[PDB]
RNA sequence: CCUGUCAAACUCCAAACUUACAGACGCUGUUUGACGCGGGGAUUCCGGUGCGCGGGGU
RNA sequence: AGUGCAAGAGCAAAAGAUGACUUGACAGUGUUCUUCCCAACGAGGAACGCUGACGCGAAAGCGUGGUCUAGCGAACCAAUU
RNA sequence: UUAGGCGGCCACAGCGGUGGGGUUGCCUCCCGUACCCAUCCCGAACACGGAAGAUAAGCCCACCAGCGUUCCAGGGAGUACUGGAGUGCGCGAGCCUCUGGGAAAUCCGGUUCGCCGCCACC
């Protein structure tokens, strides 16, 4: 910009997307990165391996294509986050992927978060990812007990779209049951 | 000291003052002579003094050939004549002299010189048409105080 | 010279041009080479660890196995054989 | 196909240029070799420029040279049409001379020594100090210019 | 277009810098939150040589606790024209500084894919004066 | 803006050239065995000069 | 800018600063390069491994000292385990 | 890719600026703190829960070259410098002929306002 002396950063550092310093440490393991990226409305879960011209995705999972199985509930929450992770690891079991690491990128390592719910979900799918069981959320915040004890504090409804009144975190249980089944169209 | 010791270019480029200390200042006073308020383009004539041989002229030889050269233009055209003379070279090359024996041979700092390649203009004057034969004479005196044989070249002037 | 250290007279080879400054890309730093493969030896000024002796910059060796994550490269220094321990960051695939 | 002929001695000439000359089958002064025009062979004759004399010969001249100066790979014998006919892959001297010029086969391939050992110039050469352009004898000659030398060196 | 362009109060910063402690009490009284100490850099000869030492005290007010403070803070100072920044900010004073801004300043203060706010969407000095003039006081 | 010059310990530039490896051409080796390896015996560690590049010195 | 100190070199969601935690400046044993271009030579040094015990982090991972190149010493003898 | 995720190359991608684009779609700004987590003070951020509105941001899409960067033409220039040879010139520093290479500056004219990979997706 100022002259030939000026150093313009790397593209995905300029864009403030990829953190190369932390990303390097992830690649040092050899195992594929379980890319866990959040969104306001949805949540994504990718399985990425390192390639010649760029990163190869072997198994993705968006919370949009979760509705395709039996979901009418919102897509950017804790019950959804586990199930997006569970789907991802299940697809990956069929791709030959035995083990993987967790990449959160620019997402913060906060105890009991959506990324740590995606990580928990993928491990439960049969994958071997390095974790720490106590940093993960307890079976209940993963189920959706915290959202139910917020809909109990009513006066005015939580959800706008015609789904239900007091909210059903049982839909979590109803999905994990049919995802552990081998018949399911992945 | 005889210029025969420093006239040739054989020593490396020794100009960095952040490494060389105790350097004697320039003997030269004015690099821009005449009427320095007027432009060089306001003049029909541009006669320069061209150096034929690749030399290394000292600040003393520069001051001396600038002095008796400009002093002819102050004599013939007056103290405020219609001219402007210029010395486009600057003394950067720092000189040495070993002054014991050959033990600790790196000499102490004595003076400064300017590296002039062959074909270059040491001096360049810009005058009027009638004052031209006075400047070709200010340069005939100026080449006698420097080391090489010289060409007096007219760069602008088909008025003959 | 004035000194006999490793980084003697290495201003030019161990310094990048202003545009190639900053942190280096992880793609080459995690590159996997096989045994028998040909490599080019060039030290990356951004990367400090996993280097070799500056006297070997510009060598074209042959990989003969690895030591952890770093590579063991076989060169011929004049006439004497040498087995250089170098990380991928400081290697480049030949041809 | 050019005709390289060594005109300057081995003394005082570089080891890397003396080895190139030897790689081009030339070891003594006045010794000649028939060299193809490749990229590899182009850079060899250039490094040897100042100690040699070269150019493409005429079908006429090469024939006169081969007759008087060519020898077998091993042997003292004359190389005439009858010799050529029985060892080589050609009918007469001309079919060898043509194939050599068109760059199809070499002297080695035909059982002949890669060296045409010539006699010192009759009338003397033009000078081992200056090139062809300055009226000397070193470097790339004219087709007619090289013929004068090889024929003077019968 | 006007709704996603009309400004609002982001952070009201109140600061009291002494250099030699007592100023923490009167801010916990007028605002409505816990205050924080301010340290400094570089050695100064006016008995301010120490680096890691409590010199000042400040507070940042977000949302409701910002507007409720300004209802009593603005009818005190005589607002001028040459008291404004190029980005559309003012400071009056005890120091009180308000950071007014457009409905999309999360883009510059977030983590994931940050970007700076363009010169075409940045708050204008004059457009900032017009916003405050519209809520209980005068300009000039 | 206009205008005048520099850099062995400066660099947005930048050769010629030098250099690692590989292919090919040449050359060399497979009874003159190269390349390599092991062993025995040395002499030698006052150098000089021409050309090219130098650093010091009138 | 800073990064202890010469100079050259490295460095920015860091190798810099602040905060908290921590003591890997840990034990043992090697490959390699260097010291000594090529090309034999000690001490010292550096990169890189492995076995053991720790520190930190969610995790990859990083830590065999302070970002790299100076701060070092054979035998005998003296003390110590 | 009618707005997504991960990247490789790491300014041909910078800087600056014009224009256009979103009913249950995507991405956002945006709304809100019971919880998980959070600020040495602030739900600003960080984390979490959610859609009243929104295309003005960002981002995605079309375009401008004024600055910076890449490459190409022609001009400078086969000039500066140079590998090899010379009983070629100069008192000398130095120059020159022949052979093989070959710049940088700057000027005008063009190019460049990113290319490609894996995945997901009316
Ligand atoms: Cl994300
Ligand atoms: Cl090494
Ligand atoms: Mg150098
Ligand atoms: Mg014979
Ligand atoms: Mg005769
Ligand atoms: Mg003669
Ligand atoms: Mg003793
Ligand atoms: Mg003791
Ligand atoms: Mg628009
Ligand atoms: Mg002479
Ligand atoms: Na003495
Ligand atoms: Na770099
Ligand atoms: Na404090
Ligand atoms: Na000797
Ligand atoms: Na040692
Ligand atoms: Na917009
Ligand atoms: Sr000299
Ligand atoms: Sr003279
Ligand atoms: Sr050299
Ligand atoms: Sr270190
Ligand atoms: Sr809010
Ligand atoms: Sr003489
Ligand atoms: Sr003389
Ligand atoms: Sr050419």
Question: Which residue range forms the structural domain that includes residue D86?
Answer: 58-113
- Tell how strand E36-38 and strand C91-93 pair up: unpaired
**Dist CA D64 CA D129 (whole Å):** 28
Q: How many residues does chain B have?
A: 160
The CATH class given to the A1-186 domain equals: alpha beta
Q: Which of A24, A48, A54 to mutate to test the interface with C (most CBs of C within 10 A)?
A: A24
Helical axes D59-69 vs D143-152, angle rounded to 10°: 20
Q: Does A12 touch chain C (CB under 8 A)?
A: no
Question: Which residue range forms the structural domain that includes residue B13?
Answer: 1-160
Question: Residue-wise over C39-75: b if at least 16 C-beta within 10 A, else e?
Answer: bebbbbeebeebbbeeebbebebebeebeeebbebeb
Same domain, D132 and D151: yes
Residue contact E115–A16, C-beta within 8 A: yes
Tell me the CA–centroid distance for residue C32 and ligand 12, in Å: 20
Q: Does A3 touch chain C (CB under 8 A)?
A: no
- Tokens at D88, concatenated: 């080589």
DSSP letter string over B2-48? -GGGTSS--S-----TTT--SPPPPS---SB-S-TTS-GGG-SEEEE
First-to-final CA distance of chain A: 49
**Dist CA D62 CA D98 (whole Å):** 9
Identify whether the C-beta of residue D151 lies closer than 8 Å to the C-beta of residue D64: yes
| Structure solved via | X-ray
Same domain, D53 and D119: yes
CATH number of domain containing D68: 1.10.15.30
**Dist CA C1 CA C5 (whole Å):** 10
The region that residue A27 occupies, defined by phi over 0 for left and psi between -120 and 50 for alpha, beta otherwise, is: alpha
**Dist CA D86 CA D107 (whole Å):** 15
Q: Which nucleotides of H are covered by protein (CB under 7 A)?
A: 4-11, 13-18, 24-31, 34-38, 40-59, 67-70, 83-88, 92-94, 97-100, 114-121
Domain count, chain B: 1
Identify whether the C-beta of residue E86 lies closer than 8 Å to the C-beta of residue E92: no
Residue contact C30–A4, C-beta within 8 A: no
In chain C, positions 2-31, which contact chain A (CB-CB < 8 Å)? 18-19, 21-23, 25-27, 29-30
Task: Give the chains touching C; criterion: ≥3 Cβ pairs < 8 Å.
Answer: A
Q: Which nucleotides of G are covered by protein (CB under 7 A)?
A: 8-15, 18-19, 30-40, 47-50, 57-63, 67-70
CATH number of domain containing E101: 3.30.1440.10
Note the resolution in Å, 1 decimal.
Answer: 3.2
From residue E44, alpha-carbon distances to E19, E38, E51, E55 in Å are: 11, 16, 10, 13
SS3 C64: strand
How many helices (H) does chain E have, and how many strands (E)?
A: 4, 5
Q: Does A15 touch chain E (CB under 8 A)?
A: yes
CATH number of domain containing D38: 3.30.1390.20
Question: Is the CB of A127 less than 7 A from some atom of nucleic acid strand G?
Answer: no
Sorted by where each begins, the domain ranges of chain C are 1-95
Question: Which residue range forms the structural domain that includes residue E17?
Answer: 1-140
- Tell how strand A101-103 and strand A33-38 pair up: parallel
Domain count, chain D: 2
**Dist CA D15 CA D22 (whole Å):** 10
Closest by CA position to D52, among listed D23, D26, D71, D15: D26
Same domain, D49 and D76: no
CATH number of domain containing B87: 3.90.1170.10
From residue A83, alpha-carbon distances to A60, A142, A178 in Å are: 13, 10, 11
Question: Is the CB of A1 less than 7 A from some atom of nucleic acid strand H?
Answer: yes
- Tell how strand D139-140 and strand D53-54 pair up: parallel
Identify whether the C-beta of residue B36 lies closer than 8 Å to the C-beta of residue B87: no
**Dist CA B49 CA B30 (whole Å):** 17
What are the residues whose beta carbons fall under 8 Å from the beta carbon of B2, sequence distance 6 or more?
Answer: none
Question: How many Cβ atoms from other residues are within 10 Å of residue B103's Cβ?
Answer: 5
Query: How close does chain C come to A45, measured CA to CA in Å?
Result: 22
Task: State, as a whole number of angstroms, the distance between the CA of A165 and the C1' of H29.
Answer: 30
Give contacts of A14 with chain E, Cβ < 8 Å: none
Identify whether the C-beta of residue B130 lies closer than 8 Å to the C-beta of residue B59: no
**Dist CA E102 CA E2 (whole Å):** 11
How many helices (H) does chain C have, and how many strands (E)?
A: 1, 5
**Dist CA C43 CA C54 (whole Å):** 8
Q: Which of A11, A15, A16 to mutate to test the interface with E (most CBs of E within 10 A)?
A: A16
Give contacts of A50 with chain C, Cβ < 8 Å: 27, 30
Same domain, D99 and D25: no
Residue contact E111–A15, C-beta within 8 A: no
The CATH number given to C1-95 is 2.30.30.70
**Nearest C-alpha in A relative to C68:** A28
SS3 E130: helix
Q: How many CA atoms lie within 13 A of C43 on its CB side?
A: 20
**Dist CA A179 CA A121 (whole Å):** 11
DSSP letter (8 states) at residue B118: T
- Name the nucleotide with the smallest C1'–CA separation from A36: H5
Q: Which of residues 21-80 of C touch strand F (CB under 7 A)?
A: 38, 58-61, 75-76, 79
**Dist CA A113 CA E109 (whole Å):** 21
Beta strands across the sheet bearing B108-116: B55-58, B108-116, B93-97
Q: Which of residues 30-69 of D touch strand F (CB under 7 A)?
A: 38, 40-41
Residue contact A10–C25, C-beta within 8 A: yes
DSSP letter (8 states) at residue D44: H
HEC readout, chain A: CCCCCCCCCCHHHHCCCCCHHHHHHHHCCCCCEEEEEECCCCEEEEEEECCCCCCEEEECCECCCCHHHHCCCCCCCHHHHHHHHHHHHHHHHCCCCCECEEECCCCCCCCCCCHHHHHHHHHCCCCECCCCCCCCCCHHHHHCHHHHCCCCCCCCCCCCCCCCCCCCCHHHHHHHHHHCCCCCCC
Same domain, D67 and D100: yes
Same domain, D66 and D131: no
- Tokens at E58, concatenated: 């400040």
Domain count, chain E: 1
């Amino acid at each position: 910009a100022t002259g030939p002396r000026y150093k313009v950063p790397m593209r995905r550092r300029r864009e403030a997307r990829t953190d190369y310093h932390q990303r390097l440490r992830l690649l040092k393991s050899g195992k594929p990165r379980l890319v866990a990226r959040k969104s306001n409305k949805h949540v994504r879960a990718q399985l990425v391996t390192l390639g010649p011209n760029g990163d190869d995705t072997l198994a993705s999972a968006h919370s949009s294509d979760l509705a395709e199985y039996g979901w009418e509930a919102p897509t950017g929450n804790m019950p959804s986050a586990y199930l997006t992770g569970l789907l991802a690891g299940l697809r990956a079991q069929e791709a030959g992927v035995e083990e993987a690491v967790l990449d959160i990128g620019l997402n913060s390592p906060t105890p009991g978060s959506k990324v740590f719910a995606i990580q928990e979900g993928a491990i439960d799918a049969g994958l071997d990812i390095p974790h720490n069981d106590d940093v993960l959320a307890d079976w209940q915040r993963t189920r959706g007990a915290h959202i139910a004890e917020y809909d109990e504090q009513l006066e005015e409804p939580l959800y706008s779209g015609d789904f239900d009144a007091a909210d059903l975190p049982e839909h979590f249980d109803e999905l994990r049951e049919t995802l552990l089944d081998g018949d399911i169209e992945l | 000291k005889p210029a025969s010791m420093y006239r040739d270019i054989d020593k490396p480029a020794y100009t960095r003052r952040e490494y060389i200390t105790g350097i004697p200042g320039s003997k030269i006073a004015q690099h821009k002579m005449g009427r320095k308020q007027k432009d060089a383009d306001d003049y029909p004539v541009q006669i320069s003094l061209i150096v034929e041989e690749t030399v290394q002229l000292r600040h003393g030889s520069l001051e001396a050939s600038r002095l008796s050269a400009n002093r002819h233009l102050i004599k013939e055209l007056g103290e405020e004549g219609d001219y402007k003379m210029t010395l486009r070279k600057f003394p950067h090359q720092v000189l040495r002299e070993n002054k014991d024996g050959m033990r600790a041979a790196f000499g102490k700092i004595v003076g400064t010189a300017a590296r002039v390649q062959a074909g270059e203009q040491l001096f360049t004057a810009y005058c009027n048409v009638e004052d031209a034969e006075h400047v070709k004479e200010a340069f005939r005196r100026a080449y006698n105080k420097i080391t090489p044989s010289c060409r007096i070249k007219v760069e602008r002037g088909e008025e003959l | 010279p004035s000194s006999n250290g490793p980084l003697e007279g290495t201003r030019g080879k161990l310094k990048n041009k202003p545009r190639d400054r900053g942190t280096s890309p992880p793609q080459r730093a995690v590159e996997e080479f096989d045994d028998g493969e040909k490599v080019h030896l060039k030290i990356d000024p951004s990367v400090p660890n996993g280097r070799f002796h500056p006297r070997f910059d510009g060598q074209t060796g042959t990989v003969e196995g690895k030591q952890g994550d770093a590579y063991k490269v076989d060169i011929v220094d004049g006439g004497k054989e040498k087995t250089i321990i170098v990380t991928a960051a400081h290697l480049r695939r030949q041809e | 196909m050019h005709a390289l002929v060594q005109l300057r001695g081995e003394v005082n000439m570089h080891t890397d240029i003396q080895d190139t000359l030897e790689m081009l089958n030339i070891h003594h002064v006045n010794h000649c070799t028939l060299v193809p025009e490749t990229d590899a062979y182009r850079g060899m004759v250039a490094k040897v420029n100042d100690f040699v004399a070269f150019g493409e010969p005429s079908q006429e001249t090469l024939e006169t040279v081969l007759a008087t100066r060519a020898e077998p790979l091993e042997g003292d014998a004359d190389v005439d049409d009858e010799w050529v006919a029985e060892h080589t892959d050609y009918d007469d001297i001309s079919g060898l001379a043509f194939a050599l010029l068109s760059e199809e086969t070499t002297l080695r391939e035909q059982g002949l020594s890669p060296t045409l050992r010539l006699h010192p110039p009759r009338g003397g050469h033009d000078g081992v100090k200056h090139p062809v352009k300055e009226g000397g004898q070193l470097g790339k000659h004219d087709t007619e210019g090289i013929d004068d030398l090889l024929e003077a060196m019968r | 277009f006007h709704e996603m362009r009309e400004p609002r109060i982001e952070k009201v910063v109140v600061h009291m810098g002494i250099g030699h402690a007592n100023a923490e009490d009167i801010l916990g009284e007028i605002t409505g939150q816990m205050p924080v100490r301010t340290k400094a850099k570089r050695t100064v000869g006016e008995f301010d040589i120490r680096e890691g030492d409590p010199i000042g005290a400040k507070v940042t007010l977000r949302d409701e606790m910002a507007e409720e403070f300004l209802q009593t803070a603005l009818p005190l100072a005589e607002l001028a024209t040459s008291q404004f920044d190029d980005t559309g900010n003012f400071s009056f004073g005890l120091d009180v500084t308000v950071n007014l801004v457009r409905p999309g300043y999360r883009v510059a203060k977030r983590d994931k894919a940050s970007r700076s706010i363009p010169t075409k969407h940045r708050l204008n000095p004059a457009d900032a004066v017009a916003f405050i003039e519209s809520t209980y006081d005068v300009e000039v």
